[PDB]
Write a protein that binds this ligand. Structure first.
Ligand SMILES: [Cl-]
Ligand SMILES: [Cl-]
Ligand SMILES: [Zn+2]
Ligand SMILES: [Zn+2]
Lengths: 30, 21, 30, 21, 30, 30, 21, 21, 30, 30, 21, 21
């Protein structure tokens, strides 16, 4: 596939896409 | 973290899987 | 605020907005 | 859970807030 | 909750989230 | 342009695109 | 209204345009 | 207005409710 | 309608809106 | 990766993420 | 096609990838 | 191309139709 900048809501959209049913954590403080 | 890896820098979908549960 | 009907990626968007810099965990069933 | 509840029924932002870190 | 920058389509998404059935106006000229 | 089938937040996105800097009002029933 | 029409049926961008300010 | 309050500056969800009908 | 900056996923959202059933190509390399 | 259930604009978002700078073609039936 | 398949059934990112240029 | 026309510069919905199939 590719590497892009994924930021903010676009990042969590991507996480959703990628992880789906597995679920994911979005933890910007790290 | 993810913001640095994927927003500030650039990441693949594969890397994004790092943050799956 | 109003109650929400949120499916798929719309839930993740909503979590994003609600949680901001705190981030969040997305944990669907199964 | 919240993912299913928001989609099959309704949910509030306040309920969503429980899922913040 | 939090305060973030909400711009463009993300702002009107947030308005939609927040206002829902009430409806909202998006009036960038002010 | 093509006709649209737009529910929920997708309607607001479409309004956003269509109206641009003019902005818009989102007024659902009830 | 337009919100319901676009979702239950279809609507055009031209109809949407009526909702600009 | 909203763009200044929420995009240029920073606003809460509560402030965004200012623009509800 | 209007002219705005439409970038990234927002651009392909707009293409989707505008083109719909016709389909579209998104070809950023040009 | 997980399998996807993607309708409407969500398909285009997914294509966007998957294809990145390569871009993509969106070609629905009929 | 892929547009219909992803929506009526499911599809994978790998299948989606075939639609990149 | 489209990115130049619509992101870097500014484009109308009409121009975006240039990229329809
Ligand atoms: Cl949807
Ligand atoms: Cl953006
Ligand atoms: Zn964006
Ligand atoms: Zn949707």
């Amino acid at each position: 596939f590719v590497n892009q900048h994924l930021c903010g809501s676009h990042l969590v959209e991507a996480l959703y896409l990628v992880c789906g049913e597995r679920g994911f954590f979005y933890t910007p403080k790290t | 973290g993810i913001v640095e890896q994927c927003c500030t820098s650039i990441c693949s979908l594969y890397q994004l899987e790092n943050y799956c549960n």
